[PDB]
Enzyme design. Structure first.
Site, PDB file in Angstrom:
ATOM      1  N   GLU A   1      39.267 -15.988 -16.278  1.00  0.00           N
ATOM      2  CA  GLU A   1      38.598 -16.461 -14.769  1.00  0.00           C
ATOM      3  C   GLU A   1      39.928 -16.605 -13.446  1.00  0.00           C
ATOM      4  OE1 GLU A   1      35.850 -19.179 -15.117  1.00  0.00           O
ATOM      5  OE2 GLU A   1      35.176 -17.724 -15.976  1.00  0.00           O
TER       6      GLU A   1
ATOM      7  N   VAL B   1      34.940  -8.938  -9.357  1.00  0.00           N
ATOM      8  CA  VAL B   1      34.853  -8.394  -8.428  1.00  0.00           C
ATOM      9  C   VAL B   1      35.860  -9.599  -7.431  1.00  0.00           C
ATOM     10  CG1 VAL B   1      34.196  -6.421  -8.133  1.00  0.00           C
ATOM     11  CG2 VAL B   1      34.072  -8.467  -6.502  1.00  0.00           C
TER      12      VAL B   1
ATOM     13  N   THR C   1      29.205  -5.010   5.251  1.00  0.00           N
ATOM     14  CA  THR C   1      27.635  -5.368   5.491  1.00  0.00           C
ATOM     15  C   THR C   1      27.045  -7.052   5.187  1.00  0.00           C
ATOM     16  OG1 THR C   1      26.588  -3.210   4.344  1.00  0.00           O
ATOM     17  CG2 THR C   1      25.346  -4.994   5.391  1.00  0.00           C
TER      18      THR C   1
ATOM     19  N   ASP D   1      39.635 -32.685  -2.843  1.00  0.00           N
ATOM     20  CA  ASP D   1      38.784 -31.909  -4.150  1.00  0.00           C
ATOM     21  C   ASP D   1      39.263 -31.696  -5.630  1.00  0.00           C
ATOM     22  OD1 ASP D   1      37.970 -30.530  -1.271  1.00  0.00           O
ATOM     23  OD2 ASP D   1      39.658 -29.722  -1.202  1.00  0.00           O
TER      24      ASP D   1
ATOM     25  N   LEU E   1      35.233 -14.055 -13.076  1.00  0.00           N
ATOM     26  CA  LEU E   1      36.624 -12.670 -13.033  1.00  0.00           C
ATOM     27  C   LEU E   1      36.989 -12.361 -11.669  1.00  0.00           C
ATOM     28  CD1 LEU E   1      35.730 -10.873 -16.152  1.00  0.00           C
ATOM     29  CD2 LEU E   1      37.559 -12.795 -16.423  1.00  0.00           C
TER      30      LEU E   1
ATOM     31  N   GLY F   1      34.951 -18.933  -9.397  1.00  0.00           N
ATOM     32  CA  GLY F   1      34.546 -17.285  -8.633  1.00  0.00           C
ATOM     33  C   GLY F   1      34.109 -16.506  -9.720  1.00  0.00           C
TER      34      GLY F   1
ATOM     35  N   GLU G   1       1.315  -1.477   0.462  1.00  0.00           N
ATOM     36  CA  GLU G   1      -0.060  -0.004  -0.334  1.00  0.00           C
ATOM     37  C   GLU G   1       1.257   1.081  -0.179  1.00  0.00           C
ATOM     38  OE1 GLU G   1      -3.694  -0.056  -0.730  1.00  0.00           O
ATOM     39  OE2 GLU G   1      -2.954  -2.472  -0.197  1.00  0.00           O
TER      40      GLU G   1
HETATM   41 CA   LIG Z   1      27.652  -2.476   2.542  1.00  0.00          CA
HETATM   42 CA   LIG Z   2      34.876 -12.942  -8.906  1.00  0.00          CA
HETATM   43 CA   LIG Z   3      39.209 -15.701 -10.624  1.00  0.00          CA
HETATM   44 CA   LIG Z   4      37.053 -29.476   0.847  1.00  0.00          CA
HETATM   45 ZN   LIG Z   5      -1.823  -2.905  -4.965  1.00  0.00          ZN
END
Ligand SMILES: [Ca+2]
Ligand SMILES: [Ca+2]
Ligand SMILES: [Ca+2]
Ligand SMILES: [Ca+2]
Ligand SMILES: [Zn+2]
Ligand SMILES: [Ca+2]
Ligand SMILES: [Ca+2]
Ligand SMILES: [Ca+2]
Ligand SMILES: [Ca+2]
Lengths: 4, 470
Positions: free
Chosen positions: B383, B345, B257, B400, B362, B360, B177
């Protein structure tokens, strides 16, 4: 105009 | 040939695709920008004072019926009576303030608490007689006598507005609303009381509650599933629409954050309190080193850090998204087998327990597989270039894997890797190094044949030829  | 791990990454990168000219659920598919224009079609908005970059609006909670309430028919043809008036309870007022805050967080609007009364630009009140909907509001292009008003139904038959709370319909209703009072329409030409609308009446496929709180349609229509939860705050397309109208708020959460578990957002809808939390949110963040912390969930998750992308978090599907223009840097998976996809990034991706697949993308990424058999996937040489290589921070040989199966050279170029101790000017030569003293290793590959590594990965732990896929 009354939008619910 | 492309491995299954690579295929899983590719499939998720293209999940929840939008746009294009093909029908989706019998409707055209719109991109975020196309949807935003659709939501703004009424061309109604509050006017900013000349020169003001920030729009200031006050709000108040009515304490008695106003002119509209007393004689609805003098303003709107369809409403004759709203029944009995009641003021917002303390619970409703508290929740309303959280909804207002969720809109001011994303755009340049400052809401001022005008208290109890009818002095606020935006006013709230309850009514008891059903007018064909749970609540209603007026867009900003109406006469001053109606402008800024939103009304909520409360009667013995309908109680959703009595107890609004994070994740429930009452809370979404307040956000919805308030969106109308600010100038947003439903994504399509439908309204409660006018005929009997269904999703078949939507203008575009993405008119669902997975993309906009202004929509009437269930998220399942577009493949998402929130297991009964409702978004408390503006979603992806709502953010795009409101920012086109009043601008993007570039000061919100500019520090580092954390969203999800261990959140420092002080926002109920961005915070997970237990492994049972049902999260539904779209991230708006203006700066800093940020993290999506989903460590407390045990379900298998799929997390995508690209802007405008949707993620399957904590057992739900397509419940977490990142708004257009937002850069989130890190992500932490839970104890299930997760898929973590980074962006352009440098990202810190941590899989935690479970057999995770990490990509990951780039940038020089810091990748942690955690316990379990983890796979670090690569789709392009760029990459992890020799100039800015990723670092696999906890690689365990025999458990791994480093997956290069999706690289063009192997899938198309038919290149065969040849391990050597030094480059001699031949394409496809690879040097696998490991210093048992420092526990540091490295994989460097000369794809061009000029005896200079084009691709490289730094390792903390040893990797053997048996750990490298394709
Ligand atoms: Ca932030
Ligand atoms: Ca990356
Ligand atoms: Ca990378
Ligand atoms: Ca592992
Ligand atoms: Zn509405
Ligand atoms: Ca950031
Ligand atoms: Ca995991
Ligand atoms: Ca793991
Ligand atoms: Ca080279």
């Amino acid at each position: 105009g009354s939008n619910s | 040939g492309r491995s299954d791990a690579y295929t899983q990454v590719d499939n998720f990168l293209h999940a929840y695709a939008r746009g294009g000219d093909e029908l989706v659920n019998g409707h055209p598919s719109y991109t975020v920008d196309q949807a935003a224009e659709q939501i703004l079609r009424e061309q109604a908005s509050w006017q900013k004072a000349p020169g003001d970059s920030v729009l200031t609006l006050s709000y108040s909670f009515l304490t008695k019926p106003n002119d509209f309430f007393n004689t609805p028919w003098k303003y709107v043809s369809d409403i004759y009576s709203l029944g009995k008036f009641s003021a917002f309870s303390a619970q409703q007022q508290a929740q309303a303030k959280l909804s207002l805050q969720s809109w001011s967080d994303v755009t340049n609007i400052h809401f001022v608490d005008a208290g109890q009364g009818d002095q606020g630009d935006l006013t709230f009140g309850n009514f008891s007689s059903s007018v064909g909907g749970a609540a209603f509001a007026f867009l900003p292009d109406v006469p001053d006598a109606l402008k800024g008003q939103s009304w909520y139904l409360i009667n013995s038959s309908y109680s959703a507005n009595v107890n609004p709370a994070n994740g429930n319909y009452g809370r979404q209703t307040l956000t919805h609303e308030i969106g109308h009072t600010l100038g947003l329409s439903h994504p399509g030409d439908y309204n409660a009381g006018e005929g009997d609308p269904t999703y078949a009446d939507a203008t575009y496929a993405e008119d669902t509650r997975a993309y906009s709180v202004m929509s009437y349609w269930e998220e399942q229509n577009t493949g998402q599933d929130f297991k009964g939860a409702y978004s408390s705050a503006p979603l992806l397309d709502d953010i795009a629409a409101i920012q086109k109208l009043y601008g993007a708020n570039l000061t919100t959460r500019t520090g580092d954050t954390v969203y999800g578990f261990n959140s420092n957002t002080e926002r109920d809808f961005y915070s997970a309190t237990s492994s049972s939390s049902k999260l539904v949110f779209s991230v708006w963040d203006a700066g800093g080193n940020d993290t999506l912390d989903f460590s407390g969930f045990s379900q298998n998750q799929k997390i995508n850090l690209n802007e405008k992308a949707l993620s399957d978090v904590g057992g739900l599907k397509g419940n977490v998204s990142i708004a257009a223009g937002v850069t989130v840097e890190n992500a932490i998976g839970g104890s299930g087998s997760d898929l973590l996809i980074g962006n352009d990034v440098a990202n810190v991706l941590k899989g935690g327990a479970g057999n995770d697949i990490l990509y990951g993308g780039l940038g020089a990424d810091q990748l942690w597989g955690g316990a379990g058999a983890d796979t670090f996937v690569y789709g392009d040489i760029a990459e992890s270039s020799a100039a800015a290589p990723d670092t696999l921070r906890d690689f365990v040989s025999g458990q791994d894997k480093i997956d290069l199966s999706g690289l063009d050279a192997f899938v198309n170029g038919g290149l065969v890797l040849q391990y050597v101790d030094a480059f001699a000017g031949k394409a496809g030569q690879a040097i696998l190094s490991y210093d048992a003293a420092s526990k540091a290793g490295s994989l460097a590959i000369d794809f061009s044949g000029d005896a200079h590594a084009d691709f490289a990965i730094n390792l903390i732990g040893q990797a053997t030829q048996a750990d490298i896929v394709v």
